[PDB]
């Protein structure tokens, strides 16, 4: 709305590697996340196809399509409730203390639903899981929601 945030246009100049002021359709998922929006990858996929837009063939972009797609994704930020994120992992391990065994969270984050690479899974556990093999998800989900 501007509140006209012109820093979204300045961040589009940091993600366009050619400097022509266009951003390919394959970068739009990760740049919506870097502007403070977390649409799921199936949602980013649907919307695209919904609009008869094929992410399979070469793509370019213009700021005039990327701005309204970020504004259509911005209504879905009401789905980011931290009660359900901590209660999900509290149902994932027994006893009254928030600890996932290391390999349980790593294999679930790579193979269940939207596949996260094991390189990204190791980069998200690095520092929050110590050598006991127990990830405290009270501080883990706190630090994941700090970015």
């Amino acid at each position: 709305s501007k509140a006209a945030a012109d820093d979204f246009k300045e961040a589009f100049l940091l993600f366009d590697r050619t400097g022509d002021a266009k951003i390919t359709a394959s970068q739009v998922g990760d740049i919506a996340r870097a502007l403070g929006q977390n649409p799921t990858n199936a949602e980013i996929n649907k919307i695209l196809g919904n609009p008869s837009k094929e992410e399979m063939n070469a793509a370019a972009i213009t700021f005039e399509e990327f701005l309204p797609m970020l504004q259509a994704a911005a209504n879905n930020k009401d789905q980011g409730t931290f009660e359900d994120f901590v209660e999900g992992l509290r149902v994932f391990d027994k006893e009254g203390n928030g600890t996932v065994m290391g390999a349980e969270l790593r294999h679930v984050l790579a193979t269940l639903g939207e596949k996260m690479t094991e390189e990204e899974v190791e980069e998200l556990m690095k520092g929050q899981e110590d050598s006991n093999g127990c990830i405290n998800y009270e501080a883990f989900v706190k630090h994941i929601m700090s970015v």
Binding site: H107, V108, A110
Partner: protein, 50 residues
């Protein structure tokens, strides 16, 4: 019908009809969350399916 076989199936189906044996469960479905279901099935023939 007169055996009881068909009546046991009935009562089952009111119940929990289909019942999968664990290995028979692993093999056929490991592939679904491949990493985490395979580990489960291999690590404990039963605990796996779990």
């Amino acid at each position: 019908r007169c055996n009881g076989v068909l009546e046991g199936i009935r009562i089952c189906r009111k119940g929990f009809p289909s019942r999968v044996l664990y290995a028979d469960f692993k093999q056929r479905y490991r592939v679904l969350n491949a990493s985490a279901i395979p580990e489960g099935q291999f690590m404990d023939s039963k605990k796996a399916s779990e």
